[PDB]
Design a protein around this ligand. Structure first.
Ligand code: CLR
Ligand code: CLR
Lengths: 168, 115, 115, 168
């Protein structure tokens, strides 16, 4: 899977995982429907917790999303924000970045994620492997080989990050 | 943007909707509060009071308080005073509403059941 | 514009609101229809069925039908298909619910009073 | 009133008359509340008619309006649509006109009204007097002496109407 994804021929497409959340909510509450705990001796009925489960799962399922795409076509594409049907965000460069983000806990453990920054864009969260830095900018160079725009790092400019298009 | 399209689909803009959900929680909870005082004052038909659902609607109360707070926090950075005034008013009314129902339940404590 | 400010005040944009009023008329009339059917089928409690408010909610039915129509006509010129689909769907559901309640009332005729 | 209003020093201000309708609806309902008709012999109760009247009157009363104004100040004013608080419409000329409109019945009687045309502007309906044509462009010339913009007539251009600013 290391090779196949980086070339990302022309456009890339993207989706969301909230449909998974809605599906597991529906499954769990459907389990909750039939033969729940019998706590009439507790002088109460707990059906409204799964009723709020109905409400939450039905809303989370309603967040449908067709294939979030851009004009990342390996050309002079404007990186206009594209959705099947409607279009919202347009911009001549200078907005679509790729940035490394860091998070820390009370102990101090560092977790690293990636985000394709822009006007209401989609992130680049890698698949559940962030303890070390590994190579960092090699995938950034591969994105550059795609359609070079930026490869931003943490904090300010300083060093250790590369820019390609600038608005001055 | 096309609020039009904003309200169009796939989902919706940021938060908002999550703030107006607290509004309709306020609607239903003020309704059951009104029913509760109405049954406490004149008709006196305690068999059909809200004696039976007592902790689940309290959990709904606290989740609505948290929802209105989180919506205010998630909508404050728009830079517009009207949205902040909106969210803060809903938070204030929900909080006073919650304290009102807490006081009324704590008052009618001799009418439920006994341990 | 600032839908924001549109929803701000003094009044509001064109029609719209007048279209979404037919929606909440549909909500309340659907609730009343459901109560009528529920009391007709199982509980058999003709004492508290809506035999008493007969012509006034029919007048509410007809003004809601006219309101949904006038909203559709006054909102069609925006040139956008989604608003027209919204208004036409509301008109269709209101007409269907009106005809359904007319059939229900014409059916249960031997149960009100006699002249 | 003929020499007071057409001078209209600098800005003009305008309001709506829907508050009159709301107040009249409130008065009619308050009459309807106490000691209405007793038609229990009609096997019906008609409180929902004044209830719907209250819904309508409360909604119409909510149409508040601070003094609809423009930049009709007797200068190089932009005619920017102005409201205490928010502002919406802005345009460089070519939009604020004054147009005569005609209405007819089945018999054929003609009624003449006037409208200050523009993006969501206010009209110039005269005080309940339209049976004869009188002077037409004399009040139009007075508006021209104010801040000459247009004085449009019915139908197309043809003749009998004057323009002052054009966008070509
Ligand atoms: C599920 C989430 C959205 C919370 C909504 C809570 C709803 C489902 C709850 C809270 C208030 C509840 C009602 C409160 C009072 C009455 C009257 C009583 O004699 C029987 C129960 C009955 C009829 C309850 C039915 C369920 C109810 C409407
Ligand atoms: C006034 C405009 C907005 C129309 C709305 C009509 C409303 C106010 C009317 C229409 C339907 C009506 C209800 C229909 C059925 C019931 C149950 C019945 O046993 C007593 C009357 C009662 C409780 C009515 C109360 C008033 C009601 C809710």
């Amino acid at each position: 899977m290391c090779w196949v994804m980086p070339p990302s021929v022309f456009v890339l497409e993207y989706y969301l995982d909230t449909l998974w959340k809605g599906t597991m909510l529906f499954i769990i509450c459907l389990v909750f429907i039939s033969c729940n705990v019998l706590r009439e001796v507790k002088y109460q009925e707990t059906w409204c917790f799964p009723a709020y489960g109905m409400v939450i799962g039905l809303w989370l399922m309603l967040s449908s999303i067709p294939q979030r795409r851009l004009v990342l076509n390996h050309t002079r594409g404007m990186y206009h924000f594209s959705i099947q049907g409607r279009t919202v965000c347009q911009g001549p460069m200078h907005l679509v970045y790729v940035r490394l983000a860091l998070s820390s806990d009370a102990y101090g453990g560092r977790f690293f994620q990636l985000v394709l920054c822009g006007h209401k864009l989609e992130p680049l969260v890698l698949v559940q492997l962030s303890e070390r830095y590994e190579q960092m900018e090699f995938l950034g160079r591969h994105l550059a080989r795609k359609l070079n725009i930026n490869y931003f790092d943490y904090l300010a400019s300083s060093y250790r990050h590369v820019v390609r298009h600038w608005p001055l | 943007m096309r609020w039009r399209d904003r309200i169009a689909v796939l989902c919706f803009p940021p938060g908002l909707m999550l703030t107006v959900a607290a509004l309709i929680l306020f609607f239903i909870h003020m309704g059951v509060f009104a029913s509760d005082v109405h049954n406490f004052c004149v008709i006196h038909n305690y068999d059909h009071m809200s004696f039976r659902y007592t902790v689940v609607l309290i959990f709904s109360q606290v989740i609505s308080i948290g929802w209105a707070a989180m919506g205010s926090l998630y909508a404050e950075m728009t830079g517009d005073k009207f949205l902040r005034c909106f969210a803060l008013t809903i938070l204030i009314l929900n909080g006073a509403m919650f304290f009102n129902r807490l006081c009324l339940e704590f008052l009618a404590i001799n009418y439920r059941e006994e341990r």
